[PDB]
Structures are given as C-alpha cells and as structure tokens.
Write a protein that binds this ligand. Structure first.
Ligand SMILES: CC(=O)Nc1cc(C)[nH]n1
Ligand SMILES: [Cl-]
Ligand SMILES: [Mg+2]
Ligand SMILES: [Mg+2]
Ligand SMILES: [Mg+2]
Ligand SMILES: [Mg+2]
Lengths: 194, 194
C-alpha cells in the first residue's frame, strides 16, 4: 500500500546526506519525510555490530564492549564493537576484522543476522549483528592487540553476561557515559528471559 | 580527553538538521565529524521512547508486542518496538504508555525505565528511553484493543511469543520484504542466548 514516489536531495556531505522523501500514505494522500542516509553504502548493510562472547574456563562468560568518544553525542558511549563493511567484504569478515581492530580479540562466527535497521524513522542505516565467541584461553587472545585505524581511540570494557544490565547501569551512574540502545536491549532481554 | 570544540549548522530541515562537528582527539589534534540531530528536542531527557511491551495472559505464554509500519527513510516496512517522541513536558513513562496505547490499543503498566540510550551514536545525537511495560491481557480494557493512530500513522500490531521470538521474526522476514529493527533483533538474540 505505501511506497516511495521520489527523493529530493537537501544536502550532501562527505559521509551523510539529508533527503526529502515523497511517499504515498495508505489513504492515497502524498506526504513528505526528512530522511538521512550515509554516502558510503555500495553491500548487505552499512555496517556490522559484533556481539563478542568472551569464554574463559573457570570464569564468568563476558560480553566485550567498547567505549569511544562520539562526536554526534558530545560524549563517551558504550557500544558493541562495530564498523562499516568495506566494499566487497562479507559481513562475517567485517565482524571479525572490526572485533580485532577494536578489541585485539580473535573470534569465531556463531551466527549472523539479516540486515537490521538502526533508526528507521530517521535513517536508512542498517547493520548485521554478528554473534562471535572468543576463546579467551587460546594463546592468540592472551594479550589481545587492539589495532586502531586512523582517528580511532577505543577502550575495551568486558562485563559479565550474567549481570550485564546491572553493570551497565552502574557505569552510567558513576562514569557519565551513554549506553547504546542495542547493548541495553540485549542486556534487558538477558534479565527478562524466562 | 576528548570534547566538542564547535558545532556549525550545515542544513536545517523542519525535523532534522546536519552539523559539522569540531572536536579534540586524544592526541591533542583537532578533527571534524558530520553529525545528525533532531530539531524537536527541547528539555526532554531524550528524543523518544521505545516500549518493550510484555503481554501477560493466564494460560498463555508471554508475548512481546511489536508494530509494523512503513518507514519512509527505509523505503519499506519495518518491525519495531512501539515508539514515539516525548512531547514537551511529558515524562518518558507517560510517553511510553501513551505511545503504546496509540499504536497498539493496549493499556500497559510501567515495569522499568532505562536511562537515555543512544540510537546510532556514530551518526546522530538521538537518544531514547527504553521502557518496559507489562500488559495485563486478562483485563477487559485489553480484550479487543484498537490502535488510535494519529494523523499519518498507519500501524499493524504483531504479538510474538517471547519463548520463540527470534525464530518467529526470522519466519516473518522469510515471508515478505521487511526489516526488523536492530533493538528488537538484539533483544530476541539475548532471549536465545540466555
Ligand atoms: C571520519 C568519519 O567517518 N566521519 C563521519 C561518519 C559519519 C556518519 N559522519 N561523519
Ligand atoms: Cl554465543
Ligand atoms: Mg567502530
Ligand atoms: Mg574499527
Ligand atoms: Mg511510533
Ligand atoms: Mg506514535
């Protein structure tokens, strides 16, 4: 019933553009929407985000997260490791690469979502969520080496999967950080499960 | 270490603006970022709310109430948590219960309310509160609930069993062209991983 008629460019930067989308509402009335798009997509999705499950024997299972300054936010955020998929990269490969660059961990793919939307009222941005396990007892993960690209400055924060939501709340209460909505949603469902 | 130096308007629509953000990197070098913001945020603790609505009914498994709508940024239909922007002066909890009623017909009870969490912090400053709400589906109020759509709202309600959420989402994505929201997928994944 609903569909796009046309798109009018409003403004195009190097990384982000703003468009005015004309669409047909389900009554047959024509309406407009201000929409954001990245300029970098070519790919299954813009990006990947990695759910990294750090597994060490005789330890709690941890979810590995990253803390970074985020200029749109004006502050530090706590997020799953993540980045944009390179032209001709698979989402799995992007996930393992981003995980290694941001955390130093070498992981294995457990599963891969279809393309999921980030904020569909505002943008067309999509990611694959890639669940990855990390064998924390393997030698290659003993002293994990994070490899920043130019202009990346990433702190690693591993938190126990069994108390994830409480630990995140505590970081926000003490550290004045913003938690990512996907991280918080995952944490919630860990608590809400059965 | 890192902080904002300046924020220069590039393009302002009615609903969304683009900005050139100048910030200090942790090496002491000046860098820039293209940042998206909404024009609608006044004194709210966040732009919006998304509601995690747990429908509870005697001799039923618990369901997660979701909504399906056309999203002009995406050019297609998306499956999301019920959500909307917080009106000026409105609390997040009030916004959540209100949006849940408008979008689904259900009258919920507040369970918990997150701190402001970031939607896509590498792109935008947008934040929400994630509000958990229980719905007593045994109450007469919630017997045959009718969405009260606002002007330009056209929302379908989809209730899926919590105990099978990820597979049920996969089966909906396998049957037509639609995108599942990243927060919904994240929450469904943690339900599986728990
Ligand atoms: C250096 C770089 O990637 N800047 C970006 C990304 C976005 C979304 N805005 N600006
Ligand atoms: Cl796992
Ligand atoms: Mg990244
Ligand atoms: Mg990276
Ligand atoms: Mg809505
Ligand atoms: Mg609404």
């Amino acid at each position: 019933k609903q569909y796009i008629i046309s798109e009018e460019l409003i403004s195009e930067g190097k990384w982000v553009k703003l468009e005015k989308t004309t669409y047909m509402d389900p009554t047959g009335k024509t309406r407009t929407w201000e929409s954001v798009k990245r300029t970098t997509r070519k790919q299954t999705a813009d990006g990947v985000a990695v759910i990294p499950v750090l597994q060490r024997t005789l330890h709690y299972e941890c979810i590995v997260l990253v803390k970074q300054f985020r200029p749109p936010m004006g502050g530090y955020c706590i997020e799953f490791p993540a980045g944009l998929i390179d032209d001709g990269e698979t989402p799995e490969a992007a996930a393992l690469r981003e995980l290694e660059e941001e955390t130093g961990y070498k992981g294995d793919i457990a599963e891969c979502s279809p393309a999921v939307c980030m904020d569909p009222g505002l943008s067309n941005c999509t990611i694959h969520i890639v669940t990855v396990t990390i064998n924390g007892d393997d030698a290659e993960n003993a002293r994990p080496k994070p490899k920043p690209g130019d202009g990346e400055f990433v702190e690693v924060i591993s938190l126990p999967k069994n108390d994830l939501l409480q630990r995140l709340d505590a970081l926000v209460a003490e550290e004045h950080l913003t938690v990512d909505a996907r991280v918080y949603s995952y944490a919630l469902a860990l608590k809400h499960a059965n």
